Design a protein around this nucleic acid. Structure first.
Lengths: 312, 314, 309, 313, 316, 317
RNA sequence: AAAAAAAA
RNA sequence: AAAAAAA
RNA sequence: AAAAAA
RNA sequence: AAAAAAAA
RNA sequence: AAAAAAA
RNA sequence: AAAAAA
């Protein structure tokens, strides 16, 4: 009785990869989601060409991609995924045609086309959620070449335009910089670099990440934070008997998705730019435990650096 | 014996919502006020299209709105409001035609048309006041996405153009920023983010917020402030016996709006940013609360009302 | 008896308001000056539309004003100013046509038209001076919502562009800000925010403000300063016998532009040798002589508010 | 008895002002020097228009000056200076023609013309020195609106380009700023902002300012400093018996116009000042050389202008 | 059994330098590598002229270079290298024609030309690795004139345009400054001033720099650092018995590339622009350490604070 | 016996000045060198004007110079230098024509002209070395008004464009400021303010400065430093027996050039902008030392913390 | 502290 | 409190 | 000291 | 930590 | 590690 | 003083 959102993704994965798609390995699920996302975005070889307003270089690249041979059944996409003959039929029948707009489909009134468009949008959202989680997981041990300063580190992950479009609440990069550094409409969403995302093996089955489920330290760290978040977050994971690279979640930080500490001048008071700093290493984070909420002092070192130092 | 301003609002609400309109619920009154504001602004489906100078996208949107089916009797507007069959008549007779200007109505000399225009203006003012109070109430627990820095929070609330037009002194957002960041005429009003707006249940009956009236903490906080104001304002409320989410107002802050203590440099004298400060612990600042006995100075807390509510939630 | 400017203003006000113009009330004089400035600036209804380079939004307003009926005889102006039946003739005769420029009139060579343009310019200057004085007077007991910081106060008063053009040195506002920001030439005049302006009842008569004149505190303060100026300027006033309402002037401020100590002979420089701001003093020139009065450190408006409480 | 410069100045002023020229009033001498500078600079009405490379706006003013009638005999100059009927003859005879250059005169070989040009140059130098002294004297009790920051005060006084040309090392202003910012050759001179300049009544006589001279406090301060200088320099004066108005000079400041920098070299660190290394500014001292000897007087930390203002209040 | 990359370089060096190319001297290998780099980039006299968009001065220089007599067999290039007569044939057959782009070669489908272009590009990469190592080795005792402040010292090595084209990750200078001070594509590589480059006598045989091989202190320091890096890196070397200017590598620094000390704000915490300096107020920079990978394991060694250039000078 | 440069310089000076040219007086050699540098740059009267891209005022100046009669035979130069009647022949022969460029001469292929141009370039280098040495010697007892702050003293000496073209590594001033500010190619040379330049009586002879040479304090200091350089360098001298005016050199400072104290960040460390000042907070510069190399060895001598001009002023009082 | 490039 | 008046 | 010279 | 709209 | 690509 | 002139 899973939601249609995850049912669509499971059906797509089964149809495109057959039995080679393991629903337990996070790398396998992430690779499958990435391939499905690039298929639904008309980015694979032999797919439609993006030549609406393409420049000379972009036009030539799109022409080469369209002319390039499309993937064939038996091709290796990743490390444990093999395409099936049904992938072509799934692409032809499920992937909406390039440039399709939901308004036109709704006006046409075709129930099948509307359902296909809705499923495509849901699949894009799920794929980009998984891809953001995988970007966090990757950055935990191998940062990007662009991240040099806090001005750069404020916009992670550096995903492509389609990734920003699908889940602009979570995605960042260049397009999030463009949006934030510009006019903001009523439907403008803020970049939640630390919004919770269950691990893909949990996501594709709809499980809600919670206390008491078996996961790895890297899994939880790439779930609730990313490479450059503070190291205190590691306290949300506890190794089990014998460790073995598998433990259990002991809590989840509060105030994860949002934050605000401004106090405007009012009734003769003075405005405060930050209630906290109004000691820096003495800051604490609230963790929700089975017993209740507790305060844990920060460590002052990034999760990336802390993991590097604790590697050995 | 209510003023015509509130009488018009009550009559319109009754006509448009039958008995489904509850006058004791703040949320229901806010929903009714918003619906009336959008109806009188020609924003509902099937109403006149705003195509005087609309751009391509705006022209298309207005045409679609005009072609869209208008609301029908029995439609659910919110959670506890149901439109009546009489609503169409009120929309046809009490809503001024699109583009109507009070100057032309007054020149015509039609008493009925002049009265209709005045009633429409008063209804717009009341609805915008209710809208501002509701925005304050919502912001108490859910801050706006666009509020990231003090620069952004200085223009709260972010309401539409009609909202600023009706009550420029209470409405912020883009239009208040445009007005302040530009030429200011004699008839220029300064945004009062802390203007005391009684809860809609009190506003629609003419009751003036004061000491000794039963309200909720969120109600008082929204009426006298919004989410990002300092938490010391919570001192203005006091729970009654048994709490029960209902208490009583024990005071109202002073200096809610307005004087200037600047001293410009002249005749060799140096400029002074503040006459009082002349002579940087910001947490030692105090607010003047007008209690039943008298004015009392209460130290500031340093945490905004939103953060204080979040921390004290549980 | 009177210079050309004051005589022209007196003639204009007498012609336009008849006997309803009181020559001893500052408020009435200010209202008459404002109305005359509006008439001479083509700001009244039924006058020529300003369309030379106006934007369509401005052209709409200009056409609306042109189509609107002109003021009728007997119309109430301000409080106690009533238009005479002959105001239209004065408007048609003494008001140069829209767009008139002194160069074109001089090229024409008509002495009468040149004198008319000179009278128009003098009337504009006098009316703008009266407007500046009235703005100072209003600011004394009415804070400007626009002025919220020292930067805002630096450009007081905020008058129309015509006011700046007539009196660039006495009018601040947006156009003074633009002139200061933009390129500066010989004709650039800095905003003299504290230039002494005699009260309207004195300005029209040609009596320069001095010591001993029987003036009210508020009008004197408006003459020498405005609301946000330091309260110590109140020392320039003294109540007359029996208090009442009108006092006497005992002195005037000595405007000045410095406690610097330049580095020399190995000595380091000093930005301000006295450095407390409250220890500052102002030189008030009285009949006996100049005396240094310690600054009150409080705004003049707030001093007036406290003394009236 | 007198050098060529002072004799030339005395002759010129006597010829131009007759007996109305007082030889013991600093203000009168300053006004006469200013008028002579204007005359020899062709700055008076009816003199040659400066059009060599003038802009049309400047050519308009030059033409207006040329057309304007020249000053008449008996005209009141300053306060107590009256032009003589023979001033026109002196202006025609002793003022070199506009554009005159020493190279051309030397090429001509006329000894009289060479002497005339030399006297003109000396008169210009003397007049500009007197003008600088008068500017210092005025700044003592009259603040300049232009000066608002130490950068502005770094170029006091603000005199004309002719003044800078006559005495580049004593005149500041726009042209001194141009020279400092611009190229600096072997001929470049720095602005000696506090150079000792004897009062005009002494300068024309040739009496070098020294200890014991009966001078007024204001005029002495102008001689050794100007308005914005520190008040400690007032120690260089002493009221005479019975106070009155004229006192005596007891000493003179030292270092009125060295460098203690030590640049980095051979792995050492640069030093901004050898003395300071080891910082309260008010602790500084100035070496006043007196008749008995040099004494270090603690700085007052206050402006000379405001010291006079407070002692006058 | 060397990779194609190093086999191409060995073949080219042999063909162009006969027996005079000694494969055990770092100076000789570096000189031959620079000569081959300037031959394959068409910079020698008598080669094609770079006149696609050349300015007047550049056009004149290229015309003069083209007109200038080309080197002749037996010419001395360096100190211990002499050209052979075959060099003309090699330059004629192996050097891709001026302006030749890999895309056109691949499109033409000619296997020989594709292999030639691949060989030329791999040779450029090897020669530029050699050139960067030589720049480090030189800069241990004779700093560049352009290096004055950390802003200037941050873009070492200052190598020409083709040097940056071949190896963006290691080569710096004007083009690295340009690339970093501009838009950063996805295929953007960060300048790794302390990337580990084996000495050329090791690079042209595939040996990987590790613990327990004999090198010279300057060799090790210019392999893993340069003149203005901190002096503590000398701890990676240990002299052998009798010194003799030949010792051994006793470690290699950790965290050579990819060091990031930021901590972004999150979950109600304040962002930190640098983990180290923040602390509480104790800004002792001389108390920091570097992690060295010894045979036993990782150890932390306190920094010395004096650049390698200055330390080598003082200990000379 | 002597390299090409010094031989050329001696030959040219002997030709121009006859026997009035003293070979052992530094001031005389410096004056003759300055005059020769003026002659070979076409800066003397009666020589070709520089009008290639000259501004109108520059064109007028050059035309006035050209119209001005050239110096006559026997004309005095400096103090004890007198021109010979053969100076015109040398000026006409050995002075390359204005605008001469080595590339054109090489294209001509004339060995005589090529050698003439090479000798001219070497003469310019020697004359500019002597010019910089004399500028230092002047700054030891006569401070410059143009130098007021360390930013101003950072560009000493202020010499004309030719003095920069001939010796970029020693000659500072406006052109060095321009070169440092502008683009820096591979040929860029940094202003070695305290390079070692043997005195003219030694430079023309070619005897490199070393320990044991009999030299006066002032000329030694102008050799290894200038007026505003720290006084500790005076330790490189010692009065000879019986005091007198000439002593001996006991050593020379080390780190004369190429001093860099930066330490870039690396391997997780924090960058430094200067090794010296960092320490722990104590910025006492008076505790710094300079390494003076002597015959016995290198000794670290504590800095005096006072300018050489000031040290010489005090020792002379 | 060798040669070849090469004016505000 | 009366008057005026959109991305 | 002298010689240049908005 | 939902429905609507929508590239260098 | 594979791909693309000068003042 | 006079002349310019959102």
């Amino acid at each position: 009785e899973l939601p249609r959102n995850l049912e669509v993704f499971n059906e797509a994965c089964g149809h495109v990869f057959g039995s080679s798609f393991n629903r337990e390995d996070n790398s396998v699920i992430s690779d499958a989601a990435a391939f499905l996302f690039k298929m639904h975005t008309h980015s694979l070889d032999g797919q439609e060409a993006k030549v609406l307003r393409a420049s000379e270089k972009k036009r030539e690249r799109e022409n080469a991609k369209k002319s390039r041979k499309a993937p064939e059944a038996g091709m290796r996409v990743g490390r444990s995924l093999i395409l099936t003959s049904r992938w072509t039929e799934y692409c032809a029948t499920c992937v909406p045609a390039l440039g399709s707009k939901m308004k036109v489909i709704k006006a046409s009134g075709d129930a099948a086309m509307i359902q296909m468009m809705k499923d495509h949008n849901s699949l894009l959202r799920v794929c980009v959620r998984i891809e953001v989680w995988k970007a966090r997981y990757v950055s935990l041990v191998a940062l990007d070449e662009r991240i040099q300063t806090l001005e750069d580190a404020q916009w992670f992950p550096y995903l492509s335009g389609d990734s920003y479009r699908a889940c602009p609440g979570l995605v960042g990069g260049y397009f999030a910089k463009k949006a934030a550094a510009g006019e903001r409409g009523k439907n403008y969403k803020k970049l939640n670099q630390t919004a919770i995302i269950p691990p893909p093996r949990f996501l594709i089955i709809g499980h809600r990440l919670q206390i008491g489920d078996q996961v790895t330290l890297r899994e939880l760290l790439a779930s609730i934070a990313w490479g450059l978040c503070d190291g205190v977050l590691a306290e949300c994971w506890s190794p089990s008997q014998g460790d073995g690279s598998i433990g259990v979640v002991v809590g989840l930080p509060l105030q994860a998705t949002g934050s605000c500490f401004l106090v405007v001048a009012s009734h003769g008071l003075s405005a405060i730019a930050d209630s906290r700093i109004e000691n820096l290493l003495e800051e604490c984070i609230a963790i929700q435990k089975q017993d209740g909420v507790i305060k844990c002092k920060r460590s002052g070192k990034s999760l990336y650096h802390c993991l590097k130092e604790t590697a050995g």
